[PDB]
Design a protein around this ligand. Structure first.
Ligand SMILES: *[C@H]1O[C@H](CO)[C@@H](O[C@@H]2O[C@H](CO)[C@@H](O[C@@H]3O[C@H](CO[C@H]4O[C@H](CO)[C@@H](O)[C@H](O)[C@@H]4O)[C@@H](O)[C@H](O[C@@H]4O[C@H](CO)[C@@H](O)[C@H](O)[C@@H]4O)[C@@H]3O)[C@H](O)[C@H]2NC(C)=O)[C@H](O)[C@H]1NC(C)=O
Ligand SMILES: *[C@@H]1O[C@H](CO)[C@@H](O[C@@H]2O[C@H](CO)[C@@H](O)[C@H](O)[C@H]2NC(C)=O)[C@H](O)[C@H]1NC(C)=O
Ligand SMILES: *[C@@H]1O[C@H](CO)[C@@H](O[C@@H]2O[C@H](CO)[C@@H](O)[C@H](O)[C@H]2NC(C)=O)[C@H](O)[C@H]1NC(C)=O
Ligand SMILES: *[C@H]1O[C@H](CO)[C@@H](O)[C@H](O)[C@H]1NC(C)=O
Length: 427
């Protein structure tokens, strides 16, 4: 079957090459995302663990940003080899909340037959864009990956969050596609909203050395979505111990201050016997942020010193920016570690400076891109990108979800690709 990337997988190519040895296969049609002309599919989540996956999206009628929310899909299922010997996703269980207008920022963790999905519940829109008026309310659903006919609360049911420990943070919420379980406590990528006049930051920790026109205040102002924001954002994890009587709390853990950046969508995952953490770059530090997790609680991450991977921005903080500016921009494009011995990772990235376009599956190390494969056209518009890799017959496969703009219908939709990591550098 399909299993996590653990133990001693088949060899992969380790050399920088321009040979086309990556051969992505399009596998969207196994999920309900091929879509209908007058509908936009937005706000996707994909998560994978132990032969299962959780998937979520919102469908809007008309406009992609201001359209009417038709339905929120939350499904789980299994990753299975089609006869082809190629992995693909198959739903087994799907749920829709009663009110699709109010669910935001879902995040999934798998544990022993069930996926847990933590979401924000808001009556004032995306909580990030109006945080003062957001109530801070949360919701968690449990889905069985193996539905059992008329299974009452086994198949689906919601859990009650009657206690949130958030220390000195006003509000706390899930903020990233997926997390990890730890026999058997759950950890969700999350973010904390700290009242700005409580943020202890020493401006003399802001790298201005040969950054022309970069005031040392910039690193503190950029910790909120706006230089005058009431809150600043701090990434971290939400802990949820399943073995806590009957009302397990949720405890916020903040990310350490090494290479601090405004809280943004993040991800924690298990690769080869140890957890990795990825944090999207939504401000001035535009080089990819991920690394082995030194310790989970408290959270400290051994950020890689990657010099080749970045992400497109706008005028102020374009791709490859490293100088402290005041900005809130960027895109979520994560990377999955596939070989620790050599620290090689795979991800889909947008190969452009100031426009979100040209999605390229790329395998890479800290200072070298080894090889790559265009996923669409060089002026294809794209956004969020979520990669998970695993084993199929001891061979490493990755599955990437990529938000692509469809020029026919003028709407975005998730495309799924399955990519085998080449076991040799010649075709
Ligand atoms: C995120 O969160 C909150 C929602 O809780 C939102 O605040 C609300 O925003 C709307 C503005 O879009 C505002 O409604 C407008 O209010 C003014 C009257 O202003 C004052 O009246 C209230 C009565 O007690 C008082 O409580 C406050 O002092 C309030 O400031 C009104 O002039 C507007 O009407 C406009 O003109 C035409 C008239 O025909 C309307 O038909 C049309 O709808 C117009 O918008 C409008 O009603 C509302 O009062 C705010 N709610 C409160 C509690 O403050 C934030 O705006 C939002 N923040 C972000 C970044 O999105
Ligand atoms: C990346 O570079 C730093 C500095 O050379 C390495 O050492 C520590 O890294 C962390 C992460 O940014 C810093 O917060 C510490 O101050 C560094 N300690 C020092 C000065 O030795 C780090 O190990 C490198 N990461 C990699 C790729 O292993
Ligand atoms: C996209 O942005 C990058 C970063 O500024 C540009 O690449 C740099 O181009 C300058 C030209 O002065 C070189 O000195 C640097 O070495 C480049 N940085 C690296 C290592 O990539 C790039 O040219 C931009 N794309 C364009 C031309 O629009
Ligand atoms: C950090 O440095 C700045 C400037 O020297 C200072 O304001 C601050 O007090 C220092 N650290 C602390 C908390 O003492």
């Amino acid at each position: 079957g399909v299993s996590n990337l653990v133990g001693l997988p088949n060899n992969i190519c380790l050399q920088k090459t321009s040979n086309q040895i990556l051969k992505p296969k399009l596998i969207s049609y196994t999920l309900p995302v091929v879509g209908q002309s007058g509908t936009c599919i937005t706000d996707p989540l994909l998560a994978m663990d132990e032969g299962y996956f959780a998937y979520s999206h919102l469908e809007r009628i008309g406009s992609c940003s201001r359209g009417v929310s038709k339905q929120r899909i939350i499904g789980v299922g299994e990753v299975l080899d089609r006869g082809d010997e190629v992995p693909s996703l198959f739903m087994t269980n799907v749920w829709t909340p009663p009110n699709p207008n109010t669910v935001y920022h879902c995040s999934a963790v798998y544990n022993n037959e069930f996926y847990y999905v933590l979401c924000a519940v808001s009556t004032v829109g995306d909580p990030i864009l109006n945080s003062t008026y957001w109530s801070g309310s949360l919701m968690m659903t449990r889905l069985a990956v193996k539905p059992k006919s008329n299974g009452g609360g086994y198949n689906q049911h919601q859990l009650a969050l009657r206690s949130i420990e958030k220390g000195r943070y006003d509000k706390v919420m899930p903020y990233g596609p997926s997390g990890i379980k730890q026999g058997d406590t759950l950890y969700f990528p999350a973010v904390g909203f700290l009242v700005r006049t409580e943020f202890k930051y020493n401006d003399s920790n802001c790298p201005i050395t040969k950054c022309q026109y970069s005031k040392p205040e910039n690193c503190r102002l950029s910790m909120g979505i706006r230089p005058n924001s009431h809150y600043i954002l701090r990434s971290g994890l939400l802990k949820y111990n399943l073995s806590d009587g009957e009302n397990p709390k949720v405890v916020f853990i903040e990310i350490s201050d090494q290479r601090l950046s405004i809280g943004s969508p993040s991800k924690i995952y298990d690769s080869l016997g140890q957890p990795v953490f990825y944090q999207a770059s939504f401000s001035w530090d535009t080089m990819i942020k991920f690394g082995d997790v030194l310790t989970v609680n408290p959270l400290v991450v051994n950020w890689r010193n990657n010099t080749v991977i970045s992400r497109p921005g706008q005028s102020q903080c374009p791709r490859f920016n490293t100088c402290p500016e005041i900005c809130w921009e960027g895109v979520y494009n994560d990377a999955f570690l596939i070989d620790r011995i050599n620290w090689i990772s795979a991800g889909v990235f947008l190969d452009s400076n100031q426009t979100a376009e040209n999605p390229v599956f790329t395998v890479f190390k800290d200072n070298e891109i080894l090889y790559r494969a265009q996923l669409a056209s060089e002026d294809t518009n794209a956004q969020k990108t979520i990669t998970n890799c695993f084993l199929l017959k001891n061979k490493i496969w990755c599955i990437s979800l990529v938000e692509i703009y469809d020029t026919g219908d003028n709407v975005i939709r998730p495309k799924l690709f399955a990519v085998k990591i080449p076991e040799q550098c010649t075709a």
